Write a protein that binds this ligand. Structure first.
Ligand SMILES: *CC(=O)N(c1ccc(F)cc1)[C@@H]1C=CS(=O)(=O)C1
Ligand SMILES: *CC(=O)N(c1ccc(F)cc1)[C@@H]1C=CS(=O)(=O)C1
Lengths: 304, 304
């Protein structure tokens, strides 16, 4: 019993983190096989970041301008290329700690662990979600750029995020490992505002199932609803519309608890309309939306 | 910017986790040098757990009854001893991934990361606190016993917790790595109730400093208080009494923000007396008490 915001174990990713220095800019890179991935802004001064021309900035950079350090051992750079908003630095040595891995571009509402790093050195690990507005709510200081987000399926690390930007509102923007930003964000120090931070409705419902499974049942009511009726309440409270896909995805939790998805929706509806009345659910005073149905099943069944 | 419930990177501890099987009981052990540490209840059936005599149960056990598996490689057990509520299994092979480590017995209010494991395989990592009632609020299924809690100071892992017990109220009890339970808990399936879960006042104040540092300032008020006046409000709300030691410990955060500790206490006092009025602080709708002053400084300054 107990339900906690749980990150994946970080060891497989710890073994991939390096320091990348270009001129006087230092951040983190990801060493997989004989390639180091890092944000392309490694070639910028903060002055450059106002209106960088990356192709032009890159022309002034050679392989030997990219200083790559893995602990206290320097890697030899034998090639460099820009792919979207990341640099791929070819090094002469395959990372011996390269795990089985994939690059995956995740959808909003999907969760992942972030290994926060400074100078190629891990500081900590936490769980995030790709927000419906394609921001993440991270913890990232200066030097944290190139820290990555990942899921692990048994032995295979799926890299889904690299950290690039803090918006002036203190939320976070970044790319997949092909260097494509999530959402409309750009690696430029400009006016970029996040859209509505909508709540991930299917994740709240998953978490409500998690609560029932772990003894927190006070919010279960005598009501049901329909997707259409629920969705009118969702709209009002800036919740993502619930689809039949989401209902289908909640089927296993539905089955395990014997609470029909639409009954749990009716529970959520009352909670949105009435608030918590100073009560808590799984030690939270608001509706948590950064556990997927998959996360709840995983943590409730003890997958490794 | 951003402030998250951050666990230490888990790789150094991942490399110490093994599976321990005695007869038909399987749980997790910690392999450091040529010793595997695991809960002594590894020798029990659930039937035994009602009134176990561990010394008597142990007499029926030989070195070869302790099956120790590190990934898919079996360790040879060359000795076994009971120390309090843990077994030390001497194996013929030093763990090659043994990090620099200490065993430390932590105080209530102190935080640590838990690497949840099943069959010696890591499932996830989360941050905990030793509660004033010597429970932790974990996420532990059957098979999770012998999962450990740790802090990391640069290269040195300080092991402070091994998981033994779930109380019928779904909170968690365990030992330090010398096998001494935190609090009055015992490795027996009996009537054990947790005392008052008091809030760790110094941790709430640290977290309020963290919020100010990261832009959340609405709860800052025009008031101050005294330790004695604050403590009357603390009592009423089941908060730990604040000591001059706690004020001293908050000095660096005080200095960095320019908010006197007693002014932040007055802020906390108003929040306790008035609630949040449906507002949030660092994305929480209640007062978080599982960040130490040390945690806030660490995460706000980017220590690795
Ligand atoms: C994103 C980051 O970590 N930093 C950075 C790097 C390059 C830029 F153009 C902007 C920001 C950070 C700033 C100073 S540093 O020490 O080089 C790293
Ligand atoms: C604590 C734990 O993980 N388990 C356990 C072990 C021994 C006991 F006496 C009680 C509980 C868990 C129960 C079954 S198991 O698969 O052996 C592990």
């Amino acid at each position: 019993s107990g339900f906690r915001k749980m990150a994946f174990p970080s060891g497989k990713v710890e073994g991939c983190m390096v320091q990348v220095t270009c001129g006087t800019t230092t951040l983190n890179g990801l060493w997989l096989d004989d390639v180091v991935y890092c944000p392309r802004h490694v070639i910028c001064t903060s002055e450059d970041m106002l209106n960088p021309n990356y192709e032009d900035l890159l022309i002034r950079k050679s392989n030997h301008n990219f200083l790559v350090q893995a602990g206290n051992v320097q890697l030899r750079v034998i090639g460099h290329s820009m792919q979207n908003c990341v640099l791929k630095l070819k090094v002469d040595t395959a990372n011996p700690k390269t795990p089985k891995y994939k690059f995956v571009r995740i959808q909003p509402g999907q969760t992942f662990s972030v290994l926060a790093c400074y100078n190629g050195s891990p500081s900590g690990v936490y769980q995030c979600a790709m927000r419906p507005n394609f921001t993440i709510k991270g913890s990232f200081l200066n030097g944290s750029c190139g820290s990555v987000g990942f899921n692990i399926d048994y032995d295979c690390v799926s890299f889904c995020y690299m950290h690039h930007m803090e918006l002036p509102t203190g939320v976070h923007a970044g790319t997949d490992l092909e260097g494509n930003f999530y959402g409309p964000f750009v690696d430029r120090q400009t006016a970029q505002a996040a859209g509505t931070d909508t709540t991930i409705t299917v994740n709240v419902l998953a978490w409500l199932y998690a609560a029932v499974i772990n003894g927190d049942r006070w919010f279960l009511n005598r009501f049901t609803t329909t997707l259409n009726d629920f969705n009118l309440v969702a709209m009002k409270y800036n919740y993502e519309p619930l689809t039949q896909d989401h209902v289908d995805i909640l089927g296993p939790l539905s089955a395990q608890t014997g609470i029909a998805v639409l009954d749990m929706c009716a529970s959520l509806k009352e909670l949105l309309q009435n608030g918590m009345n100073g009560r808590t659910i799984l030690g939270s005073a608001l509706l948590e939306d950064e556990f997927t149905p998959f996360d709840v099943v995983r943590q409730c069944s003890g997958v490794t």
